Each structure stands twice: as structure tokens, then as C-alpha cells.
């Protein structure tokens, strides 16, 4: 489960280019430009305007999620065959994923590289009334991390802020399971009386 | 769909909810659940019943400033004119309570000696904003006028709705606090069984002298008093 020190420098340098990603997607949806700084009062006014609308927050989520999924796809596509310490036959974690024995290449990427964007009900991490996604962050923070982008992996650990968003994504996969089977159970019963 | 919901608790941890609805007429109603029913009195009936008010004290308490704010001064005279039109026979405080004690007389189990301005005083001291207690009628008057500039500031969209699920607008009803709430309403049912037992005796004329120590003993050996079970 360990990347080699050559390849572990690779995921640092690509994740070094993600600190600007949150503002640039937020500067794009506000129709500003020129790398206006995050503390711009004419920027923070527009982010509050976006916050009160369910439409405009859907746009800012979709722009910023698809922009940070690129950095997620650059770290994986550079590391997981190449940056690992043990290569394929001896690396049983990959051989369980390549053979189809158990797991996928997504499980191997979240262990070795990073978790990625914690998408909640399709959109992104929810937000308070004050423009704060947690009490740890500045209100109307245009950080990618503040929106729920986990730059940590399960090999090395996830920070307390991004451990809280990952429990949000963990629970929506469990409340949706409890409401899963009751839906399609009655659809099948109802077919098997006519077509019976 | 609009409204202002408050949950007022007494100093004995017993609660009371007073919801403040917005109609599409400029009309605002006051909602409360007394026994298990649910009653709907207009708001300027209460605002004129709590303390001695003019119709400009009600105006200034809502329109503090921004007289030029045209949204507020037009919703409001469908609420001050709507009371003067519908209730022209209610001029001062000691006559709206006569009206308010008359309609609610049956439901609060009022005695035949209580005057209507004593029954209506009890309704205002048992339901509306019970976290300010009795003799805080000025403070109960200023809180409703605050709760109308929250309702009118929400129909205009100057205020997001408060989320009732979001852990800032909710607190924890504890274990023993619930246990003392229910224990109060068992000894309230216990006094009401003493009265319902004596009224059975005065349907007859058997032996009723309320100054007698041995008639009190006969009543209370007939009322079930095992609250502990």
C-alpha cells in the first residue's frame, strides 16, 4: 500500500497545484477574472448571492467539482502503476484489483493517492446559513478543501475537517440503502400478479 | 406557507407553542393548542389585550423607522383596519378581555364566579408567551411586535427561513425534566378528581359541609390518589 519516494513526490507536486483551483472556479462563476483575490469584497458579495439560490449553488458546485476531479485524475494516472513500491505480480493489492478478484482501481487510488471530492446528493458538501461549511473555515472560503475535497489518502490519514465530510458521504450511502429495497420490492410484487 | 413559531417554556419546564400565521389578506393569526384542540384568535385581539395600547404604539413597535418602506405600511392597515372593522365593539383593554374570556370560558374550566376579565386574563397568563410570566405584560407586548417584524420581514424575503433540523435551532429535552412535566400533570388530574368527586356528592345532597374535617377524609378516601403507580 506504499508509494515509492520517487512517486510520492509526484502526488505532492500535482496536489500542490490544487490550492488555486477553488478560487479560479469561484472566480469563473462570479464572472470575474484576472485572479481577483479571495478577500475581495466584490467577490464575497457575489458568493453570498450564489449561496441564497439553489440554482446558482448548483452551478458553482458543478464547475468546481469537475475542475478538481481533473487533479484527482492526474494524481491517479501518474502514480498507481508507476509510483508504487511493489510492482504488479508481487503487489497483491493491485493483483486483487486487476484480476477482478475483489475491489476496483478506485479503491486502490483512494488508498494510495487521495480520496477526492466528497459529493453529497450529487452536488457537493452542504453549507450553513453563514457561508461556512464547517466552523473551521472562513465564511465564503474559496478553498477546494473547504468545499469537501480530500487531499488525503487512507494510507497516511485524513485531517479532522475532511474526516467530517467523509462521514457525510458515508451516511448518505447508508440512508439511501434503507430506502432502496422498499421501492423496488413493491414494483416487483405488482408485476407478478398480472404477468403470473 | 409562512409563519413564526415560538416554543415558550415556563419556569417549571412545561412548554407551550404559539405559532403566528400569515394570511394572504394582510391578516395574521395566533395559534395555540390548549387541551388537545387548536384555537385561532387574531393577533391584534391579543396585542390590544396585553396592555393598554393605542393603534400607533402597535404601529411604532412594528414600524420603528422606515415610514417610507411601502411594503410594511400596506400589510399593516389590513391588520389594524381589519380589527376595527370586524370588532368595533372592543375599545379598551378591559373589554377585549371580556370578549376573550367569554369565548374561552368553557374550555379553561372557569368557575361561575370568575368575571370575564378574570378569565381572559388567565388565557393571557397561561398561553401567550409563558416564558415571561405574569405581570410581564409589557414584555409580552414587545415580543409579539418583534414577532411581526420577523413575519413581515419573511414574506418580503429579507430573511431566510430558519431550519428546524439544523441543530442550532433545537435543544435536548432531558430525562428527569420530562419526568417532572408528566408528574405535574398527574397531580393536576388529581385535583380535578377531587372536584369531580365532590360534584358527584352535590348532585345529591348527602352530607356536604366543607368546613368539616371528616368530610374531607371521606372524599379523599374515594379519589384514587396513587400517582406513584
Amino acid at each position: 500500500l506504499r508509494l515509492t519516494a520517487e512517486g510520492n513526490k509526484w502526488r505532492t507536486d500535482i496536489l500542490k497545484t490544487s490550492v488555486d483551483t477553488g478560487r479560479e472556479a469561484a472566480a469563473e462563476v462570479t464572472n470575474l477574472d484576472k485572479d481577483t483575490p479571495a478577500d475581495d469584497p466584490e467577490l464575497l458579495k457575489r458568493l453570498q448571492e450564489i449561496l441564497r439560490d439553489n440554482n446558482k449553488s448548483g452551478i458553482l458546485d458543478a464547475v468546481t467539482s469537475s475542475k478538481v476531479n481533473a487533479i484527482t485524475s492526474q494524481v491517479v494516472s501518474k502514480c498507481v502503476p508507476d509510483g508504487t513500491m511493489k510492482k504488479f505480480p508481487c503487489n497483491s493489492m493491485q493483483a486483487m484489483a486487476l484480476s477482478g478478484a475483489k475491489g476496483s482501481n478506485v479503491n486502490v487510488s483512494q488508498i494510495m493517492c487521495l480520496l477526492g471530492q466528497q459529493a453529497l446528493e450529487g452536488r457537493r458538501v452542504p453549507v450553513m446559513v453563514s457561508g461556512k461549511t464547517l466552523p473551521s473555515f472562513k465564511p465564503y472560503e474559496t478553498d477546494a478543501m473547504a468545499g469537501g475535497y480530500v487531499k488525503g489518502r487512507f494510507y497516511s490519514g485524513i485531517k479532522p475537517q475532511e474526516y467530517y465530510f467523509h462521514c457525510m458521504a458515508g451516511r448518505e450511502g447508508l440512508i439511501d440503502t434503507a430506502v432502496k429495497t422498499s421501492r423496488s420490492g413493491y414494483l416487483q410484487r405488482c408485476l407478478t400478479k398480472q404477468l403470473e | 406557507h409562512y409563519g413564526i413559531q415560538i416554543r415558550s417554556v415556563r419556569p417549571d419546564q412545561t412548554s407551550q407553542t404559539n405559532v403566528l400565521h400569515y394570511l394572504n389578506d394582510g391578516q395574521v393569526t395566533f395559534r395555540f393548542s390548549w387541551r388537545k384542540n387548536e384555537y385561532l384568535v387574531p393577533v391584534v385581539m391579543i396585542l390590544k389585550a396585553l396592555c393598554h395600547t393605542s393603534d400607533r404604539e402597535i404601529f411604532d413597535g412594528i414600524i420603528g423607522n422606515d415610514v417610507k418602506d411601502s411594503f410594511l405600511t400596506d400589510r399593516l392597515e389590513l391588520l389594524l383596519r381589519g380589527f376595527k372593522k370586524r370588532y368595533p365593539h372592543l375599545q379598551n383593554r378591559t373589554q377585549v378581555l371580556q370578549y376573550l374570556g367569554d369565548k374561552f370560558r368553557v374550555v379553561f374550566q372557569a368557575s361561575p364566579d370568575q368575571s370575564d376579565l378574570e378569565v381572559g386574563q388567565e388565557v393571557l397568563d397561561r398561553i401567550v408567551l409563558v416564558h415571561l410570566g405574569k405581570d410581564g405584560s409589557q414584555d409580552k407586548f414587545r415580543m409579539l411586535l418583534f414577532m411581526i417584524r420577523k413575519l413581515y420581514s419573511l414574506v418580503a424575503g429579507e430573511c431566510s427561513p430558519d431550519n428546524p433540523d439544523a441543530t442550532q435551532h433545537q435543544e435536548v429535552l432531558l430525562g428527569g425534566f420530562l419526568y417532572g412535566m408528566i408528574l405535574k400533570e398527574k397531580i393536576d388530574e388529581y385535583l380535578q378528581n377531587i372536584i369531580a368527586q365532590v360534584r358527584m356528592d352535590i348532585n345529591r345532597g348527602m352530607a356536604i359541609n366543607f368546613k368539616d374535617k371528616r368530610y374531607m377524609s371521606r372524599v379523599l378516601m374515594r379519589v384514587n390518589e396513587n400517582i406513584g403507580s
Binding site: 414494483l187 405488482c190 400478479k193 404477468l195 403470473e196 | 400596506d74 400589510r75 389590513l78 383596519r81
Partner: protein, 288 residues
Amino acid sequence: IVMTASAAIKTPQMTLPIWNDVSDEQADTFCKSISKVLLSEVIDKVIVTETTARSYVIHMRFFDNNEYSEEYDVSKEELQNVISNQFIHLLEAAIVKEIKKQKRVEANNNMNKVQRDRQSAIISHHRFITKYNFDDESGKWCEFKLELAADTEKLLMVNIVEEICRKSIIRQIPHIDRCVHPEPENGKRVLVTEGVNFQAMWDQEAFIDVDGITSNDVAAVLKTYGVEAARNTIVNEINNVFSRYAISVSFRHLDLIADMMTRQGTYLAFNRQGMETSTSSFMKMSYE
């Protein structure tokens, strides 16, 4: 589809295959000539001054004429005919309805003969409008004065006007809310219509292959095209559900579900109401 046999689908659509000699600009121009345009979609503000017999000077602010004629293809000669034939009639049908349930910048004047004759005729056609003017030069404002009686009490006029502006249509082909030009999937230049009206799209043969138009409202393919076309829609719409989730089901199952739902020539569900026409009593008793 399967349960309840919804004749009112929540999101009914319609896929319109355009020709191969209609351009992308003439497609996007054709989109704007279909989508409905409320009167609320060309208004910046509505300023209503109530003075007190009673009066109500309703002043409208439209957007600039080079903005709603480009976004909605609406000329200022349309707004004259929309307001003075549809809006003021609907407005007075709400003011009278409320009173019956109650008693239980610049300045422009010196009109010519055209504007004067427009004014006095519409005053005769209506009940209490008494003054009327519309910006004929720039198409930026309308202007009229509802005088009610000298007896009526306070009326929330701005709440009345907002509900009527959002219900007066300038240009609506019926049952059709919006047309859109999506990305061409595998070279299929098509148009997606939020709503179903097959009868209207036949009149648009200069832009549409009308023998290739495709919906997902099965109860509306059934009414227009018949029972075998509706049956072909069911096997295509159950397939679109499973092919989205990359789930392969065989068409032999989907043809037998579809040929059960179309066994009476109608579009019958799997529920009590679809089961009502059957022979077996104990099948029905055991169901619900």
C-alpha cells in the same frame, strides 16, 4: 411507465429531428419561436402608485427593446396587443373577484391621434381604466390608471399585479413550455421540447422531420399515433432506464411487458385499475 400508467408524466419530452439543410442558427432561431413567453419575462419593474375617488397608476418598466426582442423574439407591437387585449382583462377579473370577496426618469404627454384613439377605445372596452398610454417610440413603459370607486378600502395591488403578469402569455404554442438545442448525440441533430404537442409540430415541417418525432409521454403517443406506436414507446422507455445504469435486460422481457399493457388497445397499468378487467376473481382478491 409500469406502475400507475401516468397520463401526466412529471417531465414529458419530445425529440424533434431537424433536417440536414437547416443551419444551427436557424435551429436556435426556431427554438425561440416555440418556447412560451410570459408577460413577466419582459418586465423590469412595476411601480404602482395608489392615491386617494381611488386611483392606481400602474407604471411598467420593460427591458430595453434590443433585449427582449433578441432573447424572446418579441416586438413592441406584440406587447401592445398583449397588454391591451389580455392583461387588463385578466387584471380586472382579479380586482373585482377580490372586492366581491371583501364586501360580503422622464415624463411623456402630448399624444397624437393614433395614441389618442388607442386610449379612448380601450377605455370603452374596459370598466375603470380611464387613461392609457404605451411607449411607442422605444417600447420601455406602459402606463394606465385604474380608478376604483370612492368607497373601496385598502387593496394589495402589487400582489395582484405580480400574479397576473406571471400568467399572461405573449406567445405560447399550447402544452409546450420550452424548446432547447442539446449536444448532437452521434450526429443526430435534434431538438428537445419540454412538453408534448404533436399536432402543433406538424405545422413546422419546414424545420422538422415530422415523421421522426419521438416522445416519452406514452399516453400521448397513444392518443395521436395509436396503440402499436405506444407499444414501441414502452419498450424504448423501459430500455432507457436500464441502459442509463449500464444494466442489460433482454428485449423479450420488455416486449412481453409492453404487450400486456397494450392488450386492450389502451395503456393499462399494473395496479388495481388495470387489473379490474380480468377473469380471475381470486387473483384480484389476493392482491389488495
